[PDB]
Design a protein around this ligand. Structure first.
Ligand SMILES: Nc1ccn([C@H]2C[C@H](O)[C@@H](COP(=O)(O)OP(=O)(O)OP(=O)(O)O)O2)c(=O)n1
Ligand SMILES: Nc1ccn([C@H]2C[C@H](O)[C@@H](COP(=O)(O)OP(=O)(O)OP(=O)(O)O)O2)c(=O)n1
Ligand SMILES: Nc1ccn([C@H]2C[C@H](O)[C@@H](COP(=O)(O)OP(=O)(O)OP(=O)(O)O)O2)c(=O)n1
Lengths: 182, 182, 182, 177, 177, 177
């Protein structure tokens, strides 16, 4: 069973589900809208080998960024052309990592799924390529995997980028660890 | 909890969930198969800026369409080559918008998720790049975001293209508005 | 409602849900980790027409494989360069079919969703492009659709590749057929 | 998860839950009202020994019955007094077994609970001694255990006597029997 | 699906479930304790005929009441004996209607069941004849059907008398009434 | 959501729900049958005052007990008559407290309801005065409130006396106590 708006409000009110910052107007019929942070990550390696720590570069946009499909063959000329014509702060091609502004904490009886917003899916822009299910007990912001599959797409800082859908677990889960006191 | 075939039939029978047209043979163990409409949309802009109304072209296929991966570099020669060799009515590359033939209406206690069919996923053809969850209270046909990630794929008008999975909400949702009478 | 770790263990113990081979340490708060088999499939056709039986080649890796994004333009020189530098057994570009080592059987009251692991999504590598919901009653291994969307990614035989999330059905489903005896 | 009016309607429509006879007006927010049959059973043995076959007499009423609390001492004169004053066809004291008019069949994924009617509870008349849960897979009419705890109560043939609350099972049961 | 302490707290906080008055200390693992009001109702007619309007007397107690089993034969001397020995304000035999202090309102997606307090059950005192399920959409105080089955039992004004167990409905009900 | 036979089996196997002793044959479509212990408690005070400590006598039977309705007037001759005719070890009238043989422990996500056996309900014998819901987190044997409402009923040591219906909680409870 998926939590409706009424449930989302209840759980947030009692702190069963943490959402920071929380915006009551972001609560939908059965989901909670999340927004795009201004910090992005761009990898800098020939190939990705998870056995190692990948090399990357961190950038912060003032207002917007243009995400181009892979192999868009971006040149210095094309970049300045886009920045001037569309007033974007940064221009990237291929995959780029983003983050939600929202930090969340899930209880042991709730799992959440993140999904990119439909209006962006409509222009072939995704902010997550996997199902996006999150383990009960999870604490943190949501990492976004942004990729455009047709034409370059303009994304704006703080814009609604996706939604979290909350589902009840059949039973309380062992989140992986337990803590007590002296 | 996901609705089984028995539940799907019940809800459709009592009009709790509207599906038009409805085909009882499209009801699976825990989903409902939907079909591909003959109308598609192709955007025509350098970049996609959601602040504006995107430019596009509407096409209607007589029977089939060939969807090629992005940057397939389609030329007039290649198009006629495909149309003649595979008898396809249209040839496109990159993302293309489609629609289900089916129109649905969801009650305030049901959310639905659309997923592209497995047989097509098996050939790297997707008709939705996001989770595809639909808000309770939704009314309308399903918009498809079609993209091929390996080789061109032939799609046929009216073919089963995906499935809707229905989930119960924990509580009735506020669909966003309420209506009364004089 | 999604099954928690406690439920997963219960169902596996009573054989309601079959998982072979089963590793108790693969049970998470609300999912079960699956691993990557050593056999892969690569299609060999100009276009994919589902009306026919697609041509393909089966390969078996000794330890690892390098999955490059589509149109990576792999040459014999580049392949030997990768195999020597990263010690990979095979080098492929575009979509490649894989399989989980695990074979599963789902009861008539459970549906499962497969999702690629987050650590790999983080490097733009997916092992399924659709929602990945599996019908109740399903029996078999999970077919993986592997695609890299940014840079080549190294995958290792037997590594955890994704997770199965189990959901209860609202009612028992008709899996499609029934069997009796003389 | 208790079935709401809409769910009850759905399950009856698809024959997942059988209710014969069925009246849509008996469907409440989350229950289905059942009615009192005209047939009753009165045990005639000295004590109840479940290890033995119980003797009883079958009683059928035309319109109504007066249920008196145990030890009401129903003399021959008192019974006639009650029949003429309240127009009851039969007068009994202590326990009496009745039955719903409705015959039901439950699927392997539903369990139901029978509850006596609220209005009757308020006059200390009960139609069930136990909680009233009915196994998934059950088939049959519902046996009523009628007892009055304060003063005599008149029951009418075919009157609503209680309700069935339907609950979903977490998983399908093995209704082999 | 029965609501746990955390759920009850949430539903009361957002006013999905109304409970007036409300005391957080009455919230248990999966129920909410309710208390006994000082007002009771005693029927004064010879028999219960639901087809007619019932006559009754309104009784209000200051502190406590002694509930005796039916046919306890409460002579004038016995009543005074009980009042002086147990300091009860009123002595009654057989059934007596009471009410919870708490007024509740249930949403269209919740049904509740009232259950008599365990400690009282152990002394054979019941405060409800039926299963106790309350329709989704219900509004009002809970009517108590009090009867003692073994020996007289003293009940105190405002004491915890039972509990409400809340259950989720599978779907929203049509609480038009 | 009520647990089905398969769920009960799973929860007992993983020790989520403790039942000692446990017999797989007692698992029904959606319940678990419990049995009658040989120990009973009979209160010996004039009235029940929960504000005070209750006096009682401990009774243990070898094989069976005869439960008579209240005010059955069990003279010395009547008792011997019943013992010799029905081979019962003890004869009591009114309420008697019993206990299940089974000891249980419930997890923070399950609540259980005890219900008296159907066959016994049909002979107007009840083993619980309240609805019977048991808090999540509970540990212990189940106390039985036995009362006969029609005629004397013979109960046998170790016989199935009722059943436990297990329900899932919507969320985990805070079973601190
Ligand atoms: N008030 C009642 C009483 C009984 N029954 C039904 C359900 C029971 O399963 C059946 C009686 O079965 P048994 O005669 O076999 O009684 P048992 O005690 O021997 O078995 P069980 O405990 O399963 O009822 O009748 C009913 O619908 N309403
Ligand atoms: N112990 C009780 C008894 C009753 N009620 C409430 C719920 C009932 O719906 C209402 C009584 O309604 P009616 O007077 O209309 O009784 P009816 O039998 O005629 O209708 P119903 O079967 O719906 O109760 O009072 C309650 O909260 N506690
Ligand atoms: N038939 C019964 C009666 C009681 N109990 C258990 C569950 C109760 O929580 C406990 C009795 O607790 P108390 O002695 O504290 O009774 P109280 O009324 O004071 O508290 P509570 O209302 O929680 O029971 O015994 C049981 O399993 N079966």
């Amino acid at each position: 069973m998926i939590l409706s708006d009424k449930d989302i409000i209840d759980y947030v009110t009692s702190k069963r589900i943490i959402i920071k910052p929380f915006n009551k107007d972001f609560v939908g019929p059965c989901s909670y809208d999340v927004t795009l942070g201004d910090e992005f990550i761009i990898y800098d390696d020939e190939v990705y080998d998870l056995s190692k720590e990948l090399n990357y570069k961190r950038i912060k946009i003032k207002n917007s960024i243009l995400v181009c499909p892979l192999n868009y063959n971006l040149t210095e000329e094309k970049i300045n052309y886009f920045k001037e014509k569309y007033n974007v702060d940064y221009v990237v091609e291929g995959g780029v990592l983003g983050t939600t502004n929202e930090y969340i904490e899930l209880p042991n009886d709730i799992s959440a799924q993140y999904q990119g917003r439909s209006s962006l899916g409509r222009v072939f822009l995704t902010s997550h390529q996997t199902a996006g299910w999150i383990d009960a007990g999870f604490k943190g912001k949501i990492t976004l995997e942004i990729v455009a599959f047709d034409k370059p797409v303009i994304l704006y800082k703080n814009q609604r980028i996706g939604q979290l859908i909350f589902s009840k677990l059949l039973s309380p889960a062992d989140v992986g660890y337990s803590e007590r006191k002296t």
